Design a binder for this molecule. Structure first.
Ligand SMILES: Cc1cc2nc3c(=O)[nH]c(=O)nc-3n(C[C@H](O)[C@H](O)[C@H](O)COP(=O)(O)OP(=O)(O)OC[C@H]3O[C@@H](n4cnc5c(N)ncnc54)[C@H](O)[C@@H]3O)c2cc1C
Ligand SMILES: Cc1cc2nc3c(=O)[nH]c(=O)nc-3n(C[C@H](O)[C@H](O)[C@H](O)COP(=O)(O)OP(=O)(O)OC[C@H]3O[C@@H](n4cnc5c(N)ncnc54)[C@H](O)[C@@H]3O)c2cc1C
Lengths: 497, 497
């Protein structure tokens, strides 16, 4: 019986995929007649690449795409090379190219996607075993009965609203500006300034030439006084004042494909799950767009929740399972909101930025804060907490537990392999890196866990257990072994067959 | 040929002692008729205690006074137990009690101390051979010819302004309050108003009793619009009003001995020195009063600068030694201003504080952050940078170089003492902790440096060289030896004789 997703944005597309690949029905609604043209995001950080790699959604959208190597906290530099294991630079695949990869993958799996469809209301069952939901369409109002409802519908989520869920947060300034694309003149070399510049008050402009003709525009201006223009469709010459004030120069590039005023607000819903309803992505948290974190956490919420919903659809999910979704992702929600606000504080207000910058100068000389911030801003981090009653804590400096593996090559049967492609089935993975296949395969979970035998791998333990979202749930590099291994599968994977 | 010190707070008093204990003629000018009563500070931190221990001024202030062993950042806890070596809790010593012992020490060491005397100006001679100063007593105007002019005359330093050094800083909020001592019953006419009362805005109220009839009172209020009253004498009715809104009740007020309006800005002088004119304490840097840093840096300033000036007077100072006053002490002012302001940003405004508290919450899980901040707010504080030509920077992290040693016993054949006590002669110390007098003392510097032969001390190297301000300029627990020590001696104590 169906599961309803609202929003064909990055969070909803991925989650519908996550579901359908596990043979669970999923209907995905969206107001847009077609895939939207206003996908502002351009970047994807390493953390999000690993999650796409886990579904084979990233080979291909690497290629031709160029990468940038720094990872910055405001304009300060983080020492990303201090993160454990080999990782990835941020890649420059447009959000629209990624939404389509997710669209045409969603339906190939079997997603009932409905463009031009808005959810306008929903009601829990007095039983509680379902949620009746109503949908406005060109054809008129339908009323579908679903088994779980997930609102991936952005900052103004009605799913979040009608569910009773508070949207906590606060801002001390309002950043605002415009984002979009403008034509160029072509055959002749283009001129002007366009590299991301700052002014002495925190104001930023960036011309990003996507491709010979087309260049994306972003500006960001700080002030307490409420935005002038109420966040709509803009016009090209609201924009050209925009740059002239900030740049000094004039725009001089005709026509504007799509443009969008925006304003920021920092929010993080206090509950990610109420009963049978869930919220995810910008529906659950929103903030100034830095480091690709909004797209990072959106994809990450879906991956987290998808396999967990399927698990209880097929009746093996421990009672704990779906509550762990709120636990692990409200933490990532909190850490994202937090660090982006901390980055703003180094730009505005200028009396505050002055001392916070020096402050961060002092912290960034410490290796733990460089590594902590780097895992956070690239969505490698929030390590989902891993612990089991009774079992001895793994000694001390273990940074594999509750994280996804570095981008390391696995050598198995035939064909070397990225570690994250072992999760493309959708199941758990027990990694055996002995080189001879010695580990005891606890067969009772073989329906939900795949074993993969391979040669040992530098600074990685002899064997590892992965949840279907890729988080390392067990390994034997520390004190752990087969006994701790079992209680780890009882958790996260339920009762053995 | 005198040295003129303007201002008899901690800074100027402490320096006049540093100058007079070394037989440098010092004349210390203040305008008060007697020692002031407007000395609000109730606390002395561990770094200030060590610097006073170096001159026998700490014991005596310590007996009978309370300690509390928590070092806070804003209102969070700092893991002070992670700071190297044994050290001290903050002791609750009253500013006027401290100033009294330094006025005492000054008059016996022969400082010409002048209450009711104002410095109205000064000029640097064209050649530069001296400064001529002008002092304004009731009798008239002495025009005094002196050798160096040190302005320790407080936040509104005439010396700084007339020397034309810019006073750098900014604030996003203006903190205002009043402070002083009311007379007022104690038993049960202090309710809520006992101990500090952080409220549901950044605003605090501190009520601390001295004797059962007098109480010291402190208020600190955050607002985005200028202080109602100019800084100055204030009325007790004005305090009654302020207490009611903060504590919620009213103080059964009897009489006011002294109370004062205060506002807070944050500034760091750009140059603590302009050739023959130095500045120190509040004239060099000011900020919100936290952790005792205003007092620590003030005393720290004088301990650094008295001995360098004395060396120049005595003619053995190296050429670049007084320029290290600015280098060493501007950094310490920088970092005090920086982290005070950082502490304030966990209080106000409340949107900023919301996330900056979560942020610091994450950073204080790290040892290097706890130790760095705890060191600075206790004025154990900025390690003085120690490097020498030829000598290559020692790879391992050294917690002793550039810092005053931890509170350890050192046992001599003539008796035991704490290590800060060996610097009481005013001279540098060569600590030979071998137990055998195995260290080869460079007899050249025998007149500027004392050898102290003591028993080995756990977790300290076998030999150490202390500059007259207690700072470790050399030790042999890394790779350094007799040649590096000879380098250290030339750069800090000058030519060998
Ligand atoms: C100017 C700007 C620049 C940005 N730059 C970046 C960047 O460089 N890198 C990055 O990672 N992130 C960036 N972001 C943020 C990032 O784009 C968002 O986090 C991400 O697109 C939101 O993920 P989402 O799918 O949950 O929300 P959305 O993108 O808002 O998708 C929600 C979808 O649900 C639709 N919907 C369908 N039906 C309904 C219904 N009944 N009710 C409500 N909605 C419905 C909505 O129309 C929408 O299409 C930027 C944001 C802005 C404003
Ligand atoms: C409300 C308030 C609360 C405080 N709370 C604390 C606390 O909790 N803990 C702490 O450690 N410190 C506290 N302080 C003080 C802080 O430490 C100061 O930095 C320190 O007292 C300043 O020392 P100083 O000697 O450089 O300047 P000052 O103490 O200001 O002394 C300067 C002296 O020079 C005099 N003078 C000025 N101009 C002239 C002139 N031309 N000629 C002659 N004399 C002149 C002045 O009258 C004064 O006597 C507080 C101060 C205030 C106002």
């Amino acid at each position: 019986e169906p599961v309803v997703v609202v929003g064909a944005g990055p969070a909803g597309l991925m989650l519908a995929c996550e579901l359908a690949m596990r043979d669970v029905p999923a209907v995905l609604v969206d107001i847009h007649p077609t895939q939207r043209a206003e996908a502002p995001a351009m970047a994807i950080n390493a953390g999000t690449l690993e999650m796409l790699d886990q579904r084979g959604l990233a080979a291909g959208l690497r290629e031709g795409t160029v990468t940038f190597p720094e990872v910055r906290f405001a304009d300060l530099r983080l020492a990303f090379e201090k993160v454990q294991g080999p990782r990835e630079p941020t890649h420059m695949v447009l959000q629209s190219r990624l939404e389509k990869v997710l669209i045409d993958r969603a339906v190939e799996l079997g997603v009932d996607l409905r463009w031009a469809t808005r959810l306008t209301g929903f009601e829990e069952a007095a039983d509680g075993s379902g949620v009746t939901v109503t949908l406005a369409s060109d054809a008129g109002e339908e009323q579908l009965r679903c088994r779980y409802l997930v609102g991936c519908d952005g900052r103004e989520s009605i799913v979040r609203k009608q569910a009773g869920i508070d949207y906590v947060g606060d801002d001390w300034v309002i950043v605002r500006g415009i984002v979009g694309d403008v034509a160029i003149n072509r055959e002749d070399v283009a001129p002007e300034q366009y590299g991301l510049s700052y002014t002495d008050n925190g104001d930023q402009f960036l011309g990003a030439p996507l491709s010979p003709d087309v260049m994306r525009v972003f500006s960001a201006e700080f002030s307490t006084e409420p935005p002038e223009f109420e966040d709509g469709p803009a016009t090209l010459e609201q924009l050209g004042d925009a740059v002239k004030r900030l740049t000094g120069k004039e725009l001089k590039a005709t026509e504007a494909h799509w443009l969008q005023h925006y304003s920021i607000v920092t929010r993080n819903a206090e509950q990610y799950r109420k009963g049978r309803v869930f919220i995810a992505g910008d529906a659950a948290h929103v903030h100034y767009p830095y480091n690709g974190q909004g797209l990072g956490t959106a994809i990450g919420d879906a991956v987290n929740l998808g396999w967990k919903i399927a698990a209880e659809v097929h009746g093996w999910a421990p009672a704990d399972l779906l509550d762990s979704y709120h636990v692990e992702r409200h933490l990532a929600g909190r850490l994202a909101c937090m660090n982006i606000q901390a980055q703003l504080a180094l730009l505005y207000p200028r009396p505050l930025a002055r001392y916070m910058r020096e402050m961060m100068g002092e912290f960034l000389k410490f290796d733990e804060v460089n590594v902590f911030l780097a895992e956070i801003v690239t969505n490698l981090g929030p390590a989902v907490p891993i612990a089991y009653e009774g079992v001895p804590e793994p000694v001390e400096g273990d940074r594999l537990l509750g994280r996804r593996l570095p981008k390391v090559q696995i050598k198995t049967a035939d064909g070397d392999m990225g570690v994250a492609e072992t999760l493309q089935s959708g199941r758990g993975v027990l990694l055996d890196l002995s080189g001879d296949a010695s580990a005891q395969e606890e067969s009772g979970w073989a329906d939900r866990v795949d074993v993969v035998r391979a040669q040992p791998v530098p600074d990685l333990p002899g064997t590892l257990l992965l949840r279907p979202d890729g988080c390392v749930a067990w390994h034997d590099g520390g004190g752990w072994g087969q006994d701790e291994l079992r209680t780890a599968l009882r958790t996260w994977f339920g009762a053995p067959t």
